Amino acid sequence: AAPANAVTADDPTAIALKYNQDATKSERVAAARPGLPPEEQHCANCQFMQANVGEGDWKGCQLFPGKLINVNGWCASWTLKAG
Ligand code: SF4
């Protein structure tokens, strides 16, 4: 059960960015974003994930202010995490 402020799939930013809460159900292979082989990409290894927002598997994303993503998710703005 998702948190009350989870990003929903038909949010227009979720549509534009092809966000999915489950990276295995995402377009990561198609997008081929640089930094890691596509099958390795998910929110937890993305620079925009906020480790200090949310709890557990439901964490912040700088691109979805006020909402929570799933650490196991993905979107087309996936960017290799610096830390
Ligand atoms: S920008 Fe990064 S943390 Fe935010 S939803 Fe996309 S892949 Fe996940």
Side-chain angles (χ1 to χ4, degrees):
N5 62 348
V7 175
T8 62
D10 51 11
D11 174 325
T13 297
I15 282 163
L17 298 182
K18 302 287 164 178
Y19 170 75
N20 200 293
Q21 67 183 48
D22 180 348
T24 67
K25 310 301 187 290
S26 79
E27 293 191 8
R28 63 193 181 169
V29 172
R33 298 308 305 146
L36 288 171
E39 299 286 10
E40 294 180 65
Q41 297 175 12
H42 55 282
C43 295
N45 56 23
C46 180
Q47 183 58 9
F48 294 121
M49 208 198 83
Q50 296 170 307
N52 292 291
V53 172
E55 183 281 338
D57 286 356
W58 293 100
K59 301 297 287 176
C61 173
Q62 294 181 209
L63 313 188
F64 294 92
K67 309 183 191 303
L68 294 176
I69 56 65
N70 193 287
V71 300
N72 300 315
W74 180 93
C75 83
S77 287
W78 183 88
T79 297
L80 182 66
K81 178 177 176 63

